[PDB]
Amino acid sequence: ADPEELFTKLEKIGKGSFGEVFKGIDNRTQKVVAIKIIDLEEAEDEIEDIQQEITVLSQCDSPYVTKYYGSYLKDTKLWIIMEYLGGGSALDLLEPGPLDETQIATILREILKGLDYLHSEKKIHRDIKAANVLLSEHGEVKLADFGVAGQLTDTQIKRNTFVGTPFWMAPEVIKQSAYDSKADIWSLGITAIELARGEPPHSELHPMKVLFLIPKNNPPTLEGNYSKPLKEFVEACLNKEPSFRPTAKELLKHKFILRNAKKTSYLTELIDRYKRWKAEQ
Ligand SMILES: CO[C@@H](C(=O)N1Cc2[nH]nc(NC(=O)c3ccc(N4CCN(C)CC4)cc3)c2C1)c1ccccc1
Numbered sequence: 001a002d003p004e005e006l007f008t009k010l011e012k013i014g015k016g017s018f019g020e021v022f023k024g025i026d027n028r029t030q031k032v033v034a035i036k037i038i039d040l041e042e043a044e045d046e047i048e049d050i051q052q053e054i055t056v057l058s059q060c061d062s063p064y065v066t067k068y069y070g071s072y073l074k075d076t077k078l079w080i081i082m083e084y085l086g087g088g089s090a091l092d093l094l095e096p097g098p099l100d101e102t103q104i105a106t107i108l109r110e111i112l113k114g115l116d117y118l119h120s121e122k123k124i125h126r127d128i129k130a131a132n133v134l135l136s137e138h139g140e141v142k143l144a145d146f147g148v149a150g151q152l153t154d155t156q157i158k159r160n161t162f163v164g165t166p167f168w169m170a171p172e173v174i175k176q177s178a179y180d181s182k183a184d185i186w187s188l189g190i191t192a193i194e195l196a197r198g199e200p201p202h203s204e205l206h207p208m209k210v211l212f213l214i215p216k217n218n219p220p221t222l223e224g225n226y227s228k229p230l231k232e233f234v235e236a237c238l239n240k241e242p243s244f245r246p247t248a249k250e251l252l253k254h255k256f257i258l259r260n261a262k263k264t265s266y267l268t269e270l271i272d273r274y275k276r277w278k279a280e281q
């Protein structure tokens, strides 16, 4: 029916040129939801990504993947109703200052559970990065932005498409050879660096340069004051050879994760920190 009847927006929480995201309410139940509204008139090229995300999320049912509740059409606007996640993104939560290795290990663990779910459903996220990891106010950690996610089948054996964000992209994705879920494991290893240092490797460089640097160089390493097991976690992820990369399931039992990860509810203090930080200034 009419989405402006069914839903009420409470607060604009995100904005772009083609769309806006709100905190809002299902009026029938008073449930808080995320409401992403796309101006279909302005959307042009990225409309295929919108379609792809809706399709993939409608096929997902995991506590580690942002829920999709439906789409509504009202004039030039597409309303996409989604699980509200109010803690902020992992990247957002880096703003007030660095994470400790307990927080990092917990976040990576939860991402790994999400990747394990997706890969078992023969899906590939293909844009894993801290900005795409969204937290709930309880400290749950869930995956979002499925605009370029890919589907493996029997009609098509692997993927080829040059897609993702350059600094996080696997070398085999840059080369556009046949790749699979192991590409997400590379991106996860880059995300581990990003969680530790605040930025991905080569973050000051032009994206175009990174497209030849990533295949040309040895894999990035985590440098500085970070525990050996974290550096070995990064090292295992960022193997040039995908068949030598571990799976997400295996990584759940990496010693860095086992010795450092704790209950997700402990992440609420990371969210509190952001609230206080946000409020000031
Ligand atoms: C553009 O699509 C959305 C999207 O699909 N989504 C689906 C979905 N569900 N819930 C969301 N919540 C938030 O984005 C958000 C972010 C920061 C936030 N604040 C900062 C911390 N504070 C404690 C509260 C206020 C409050 C809410 C989103 C976004 C997207 C956004 C970012 C990354 C990936 C995807």
Ligand SMILES: [Cl-]
Binding pocket: 014, 015, 016, 019, 020, 021
């Ligand atoms: Cl947006």
